[PDB]
Design a protein around this ligand. Structure first.
Ligand SMILES: O=c1ccn([C@@H]2O[C@H](CO)[C@@H](O)[C@H](O)[C@H]2O)c(=O)[nH]1
Ligand SMILES: O=c1ccn([C@@H]2O[C@H](CO)[C@@H](O)[C@H](O)[C@H]2O)c(=O)[nH]1
Lengths: 810, 810
């Protein structure tokens, strides 16, 4: 049908059809008379999988022969989504499979919808890891993703009575055709025990053993025949475990619970023992695997030349003392040499400056669970603080500020401080964020070792986030400038010479309209909700958090409703306001925000005076597969975090690439986005970081805004009196109290400028031609935000390896 | 190599080789340079599996078209062993695969040894179910095996310091290529709750739900292209289960524990709640599946014409009140009609008369777990006792004896009484056993309904138990009388005309010697134990139980040792005494018996005066795969249970078929075996059932034997004084005390006759030619003990269906 989806040539189509029928028969043990759509999905998945393995085996043998430096990306989250379409796109099989299935009498899009998301992440940090794996394979790097194979990923969100309900994400119920279990490469992981000092060093003894069994998933590069590996560990009890009899067997569950479920906290640290076990489990198993592979190439001087370990946040921070443990206790290297190797091997990426999100583990937990590691951490700290003391003599407060050990009621280890001390590179994820790190929370460390601190602005993969989710747009772009932009997104700049092209303007606006119609149809079919496809699609999708200010969006929605009710017969640009995202099960305020959004919808959507001019919909169960649907459909992207709180954002980049305009604060990557497109082509509003600082020094008084803004006062009075909850009048008292008395994120302070800016958006939407021209200027300048650019920078500036676009033999 | 293993013809060998390489590459994701023997096993297993599926799909579609009466064999145990060789034998693929692997540079026997046993059973009852499935498929019956897919089967037995140690049988660690998960056919099972009475009947409400997910395993018939199904249920928690958050997800384990582990009790009832849940789980899921399949052929009058349910012991006895529940509560049939259908559908097989083995469930357990079923059981009992009262007016003690409800400290339900009341047929498993049932424990029931009581003498499959485990013997037999005996074992009678054939005598003795050499080599390679292959191989392999009298065997061994030590320079027929079998983890006496056996070995095997004349070896980890090795190697089969205790035995039949002579009591199937071969050709000794009864009436006094038999006195004095345990002199005090004061099984009473009989065995072994001629007379008359005969009798006399040897189209 379309050119970007590859060739459907006779030979391939015939061969795909026969392999489909073979899998249906031999693999699924079904015939055409009893097969369901799910059986057909699996037959297709197995057929596409076959095409991977040949390339998978030869990529890994290529790395063995050439022995390049290996990159190990350690993460507790890999937010992968669906794999089928991504695999077809990267292998140039999409049109052939589309033809093959059509000839078998099947609709491939229907089959694609049967696949479960691999929801092994919470949001931005987890999705970044997935985009990174794609880019590393596309750039021909010898890279491995290492994590945990959670039996249950992020919970499925149901909305009941306007409230969030959680249910288990049993994503493995029907099997996972993409993974290959590798029980032969099972490795032991140790917990608890005690430290014994002998004549020849320390020994960690009397430990409890949990086995780590790896499952490998292929990661295909974009049309380069490279297939890398994501290896995820699963926890297994040893066979002599607790070995009355029946109980001992049932107790195996305790060990295997380590890999059972993903902790659903986003930007919030929960100091639970099971989480700590997960963190060590991934680290201990991964490092043994790394060292094994290194020895199979004695002398650890070459270790940093052959190995890079990237820590995704502090979650795998125990890699630092674990590497020290192995080098010192097991390989018998002296401390100083081991430390040199460790530092040159490890690099750390920070993803947030929110204090409640920083990992600070109680010493008493580490003492019991990992007694040798605590000893190593203390020694690291002592030696590090001796360096600080020598650099800044007599600065006693600096010593306490920089210590890895935090004193107080309970002593804690600051894992971020551990990561900086033990890494040769520390990076933030957007220019403003990296500057904030150097100026505020890691200022002391920057002053000691300025060379360590870098920026690596985040990106997204244009494969999943353009070609896959928006084939209509990818096609009209390819018609003008060719296909090379898919692996060289900077080429999109060539589209600036089409900004006054009447044909292109019409096509861009046409693709958006089609996307909006398709998404409007999805909402009817799957959720029985009705929307006007002619309205402005105003969307905010991301995890529910106070810093992200879904509440500010809510206030605007209510302002629009109140203005309509005041002047009903006055014309307003029709809007469909869509808000979606999950709240952590124990985050009360976030759960209340979801209830507020649905409650506003219940009033607004059923007011006869409003008509089809304003609709408020809560998008249930937001996840990767849903993002691929709503993002191509959006007109307006809401990126309205309080300045200085969103480290980067990546959802922002997805919207820009897909033809939505952005309303946003000068926060995270929004700054660089506006810089690339031009500020005239972005809807920037609100306080800058400097303005937030000024307000904090003076003291934030929300009552001031309430007193001086009558439209804001009305909303607060409506919320308090029970306008949006007539049966439970005080339902939202907690929300009002927070807004009025303890709002960390200064919702009221940005309200006026936000509403004003939204008026300017509505004004531009009234002029379809000029709206679209601004859109083209956004898409054309979105090149910098490809994760291929990001990964190229990591490769050159941190890992010390060169990317390659050269094909491997097929 | 040998004719019975099929054709290895060019076309097939080439096609097997290419499919092997395809699986190694695409299925296992390996190349020849990294592949291990295990990878090669799996590639072969997948290759052979492919040949099953075509026949599997067409068998099941054949049953749909023809709509025959279906046979449902319900069992908590299916002791399957290994599947690869059995599949090759039944599909006539053994020689072709042997050739194909040889040409790939692989040894197939080495590959076969990598497969884990499917150890989903304890012993005889579990193995019977497996032989039965094989015979039902071979006889073309529309039969289904239904059970539980235990994550852990019977424990692996390690011997440490002479003591049994248990370890988890993690049989699924590397995967199971034979099974196919069927998550689409998942069914709900209900537990707990309460009973609600409405205007329109009873309702079972507020229940906890556990999901039952089926896994299907193919069961191939012997060269008839029939492939039946064994469906095993796995427990799964529902997704809203307990749905703080993390705990709710981890608590899913509680529901899924239902299918976690096989209870390791053999001939002993343990009234544990988890066991009861397992029993209902299998029954509830199975019956829904049965009814679904029946409706997809409204009127339940035809139900017994289209369905037979065979209960393997009382373990699935809840099928009776569950069928009533479904028919009465859900289908709204009147009681009397539902009862007629239930009785005509169900049949019950009893496997033991030992009182401690009978299932008697506490009413309070059933009240809480299955409140509706208890109500139905009470109603069944009331109506049944009204029939008894009408047949035997005024016989009040009969009423209490026959009641399904047993009064006492705790009220219990007698599950055996439930089974008789609710079944149209009740059978024992050997002629003597079935007679004992009618004369003793079920006398009252036999008097009420004589027509219900039948005998079905047990059998073994000659596929696994001759062709597979003893190809050498199968070949020499085939040379003379052809191949038809494999599915018509009665043809072995034709071998009687070769009893004076000098060529045949030499060949029979040659096959045995080769088997003994091969097994002697296995013991060195895998356990580093040394044995004399020229000695008489005296073997007792079976679960360790007091009734089986491994202790009587021990006493003989010690008698032989004492006689040698008394007259060292006197000639004795050299023996290798081998004893193996597992003890239930909480069966103290059985564990002590294992320790005694190893302790005797420690003294006997290292006495320089004994030399190579006497060896005592404990066979570690006895299981199906080990049985296939030791049985073809045996000269003497020990079947020495106290008369009236071994319902049938099946190990006895395996030895007879494989060229061992039998020393045994007139118990179980030994009686029919001796009848078939002639008593002159069996070594029968000891009390008959009548003699045991006489001794019980008089009172068994063990001291009498101790006082009058000096050789027995010496042994007891040796045991007591610490001769066999010098460091722990009183180690065996419990054994001695039991033997002297509370021996339920009268070990001493059979000692004299046993030792005398053993002398006659040794005498015959001195004459190789006459030993072998007696062997030929045994093998030649073993025909009756094919499970094909047994299943034919079930089919004709209980299920009301005709067996068929006709091939299905390939
Ligand atoms: O716990 C956390 C901490 C940070 N981030 C996000 O990481 C993304 C990738 O770097 C950033 O784009 C985003 O600003 C940040 O909140 C998370 O998603 N979870
Ligand atoms: O709990 C039990 C009860 C009986 N049997 C055995 O069943 C076999 C098959 O019918 C018989 O051959 C054997 O005599 C009996 O002990 C068991 O193996 N377990």
């Amino acid at each position: 049908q379309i050119s970007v989806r590859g060739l459907a040539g006779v030979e391939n189509v015939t061969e795909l059809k026969k392999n489909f029928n073979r899998h249906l028969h031999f693999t699924l043990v079904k015939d055409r008379n009893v097969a369901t759509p799910r059986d057909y999905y699996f037959a297709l998945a197995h057929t596409v999988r076959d095409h991977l393995v040949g390339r998978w085996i030869r990529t890994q043998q290529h790395y063995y022969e050439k022995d390049p430096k290996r990159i190990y990306y350690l993460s507790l989250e890999f937010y992968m989504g669906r794999t089928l379409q991504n695999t077809m796109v990267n292998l140039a099989l999409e049109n052939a499979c589309d033809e093959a299935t059509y000839q078998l009498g099947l609709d491939m899009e229907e089959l694609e919808e049967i696949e479960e998301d691999a929801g092994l992440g919470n949001g931005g940090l987890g999705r970044l890891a997935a985009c990174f794996l794609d880019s590393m394979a596309t750039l021909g790097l010898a890279a491995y993703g290492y994590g945990i194979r959670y039996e249950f990923g992020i919970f499925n969100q149901k909305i009941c009575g306007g409230w969030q309900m959680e249910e288990a994400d049993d994503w493995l119920r029907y099997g996972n055709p993409w993974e290959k279990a590798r029980p032969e490469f099972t490795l032991p992981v140790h917990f608890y025990g005690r430290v014994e000092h002998t004549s020849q060093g320390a020994k960690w003894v009397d430990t409890q053993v949990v086995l780590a069994m790896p499952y490998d998933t292929p990661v295909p590069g974009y049309r380069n025949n490279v297939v890398n590996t994501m290896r995820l560990w699963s926890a297994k009890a040893p066979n002599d475990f607790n070995l009355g009899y029946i109980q001992a067997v049932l107790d195996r569950n305790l060990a295997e619970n380590i890999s059972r479920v993903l902790y659903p906290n986003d930007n919030f640290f929960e100091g639970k023992e099971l989480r700590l076990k997960q963190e060590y489990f991934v680290v201990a198993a991964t490092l043994q695997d790394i060292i094994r592979r290194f020895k199979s190439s004695t002398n650890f001087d070459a270790f940093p030349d052959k190995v890079a370990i990237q820590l995704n946040d502090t979650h795998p921070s125990l890699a630092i003392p674990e590497l020290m443990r192995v080098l010192v206790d097991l390989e018998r290297l002296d401390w100083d040499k081991a430390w040199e190797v460790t530092v040159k091997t490890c690099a750390y990426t920070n993803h947030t400056v929110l204090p409640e999100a920083l990992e600070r583990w109680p010493v008493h937990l580490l003492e019991t669970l990992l007694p040798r590691h605590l000893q190593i951490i203390y020694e690291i700290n002592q030696r590090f603080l001796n360096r600080v003391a020598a650099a800044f003599p007599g600065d006693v407060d600096r010593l306490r500020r920089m210590s890895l050990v935090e004193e107080g009621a309970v002593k804690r280890i600051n894992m971020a401080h551990l990561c900086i001390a033990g890494s040769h590179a520390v990076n933030g994820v957007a220019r403003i964020h990296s500057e904030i790190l150097k100026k505020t929370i890691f200022k002391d460390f920057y002053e000691l070792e300025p060379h360590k601190f870098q920026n690596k602005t985040n990106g997204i993969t244009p494969r999943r986030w353009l070609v896959l989710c928006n084939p209509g747009l990818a096609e009209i772009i390819a018609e003008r400038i060719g296909e090379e932009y898919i692996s060289d997104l900077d080429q999109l700049r060539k589209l600036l010479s089409y900004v006054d092209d009447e044909a292109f303007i019409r096509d861009v606006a046409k693709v958006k309209q089609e996307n909006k119609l398709k998404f409007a149809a999805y909402l009817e079919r799957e959720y029985k909700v009705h929307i006007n496809p002619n309205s402005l699609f105003d969307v905010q999708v991301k995890r529910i958090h106070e810093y992200k200010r879904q509440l500010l969006n809510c206030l605007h929605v209510i302002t629009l409703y109140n203005r309509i009710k005041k002047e009903p017969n006055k014309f307003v640009v029709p809007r469909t306001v869509m808000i979606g995202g999950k709240a952590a099960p124990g985050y009360h305020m976030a759960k209340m925000i979801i209830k507020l959004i649905t409650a506003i919808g219940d009033v607004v959507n059923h007011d006869p005076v409003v008509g089809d001019r304003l609709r408020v919909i809560f998008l249930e169960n937001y996840r990767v597969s849903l993002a691929e649907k709503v993002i191509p459909a959006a007109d307006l992207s809401e990126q309205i975090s309080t300045a200085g709180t969103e480290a980067s954002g990546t959802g922002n980049m997805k919207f820009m690439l897909n033809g939505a305009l952005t309303i946003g604060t000068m926060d995270g990557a929004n700054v660089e986005m506006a810089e690339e497109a031009g500020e005239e082509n972005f809807f920037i509003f609100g306080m800058r970081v400097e303005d937030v600082d000024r307000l904090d020094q003076r003291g934030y008084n929300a009552q001031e805004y309430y007193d001086r803004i009558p439209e804001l006062r009305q909303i607060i009075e409506q919320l308090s009196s029970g306008f949006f909850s007539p049966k439970q009048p005080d339902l939202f008292k907690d929300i009002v109290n927070m807004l009025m008395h303890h709002d960390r994120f200064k919702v009221f302070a940005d309200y006026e400028e936000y509403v004003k800016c939204q008026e300017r958006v509505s004004a531009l939407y009234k002029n379809p031609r000029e709206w679209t021209r601004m859109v083209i200027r956004n898409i054309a300048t979105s090149g910098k935000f490809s994760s291929d650019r990001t990964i190229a920078q990591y490769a050159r500036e941190i890992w010390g390896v060169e990317p390659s676009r050269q094909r491997l033999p097929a």
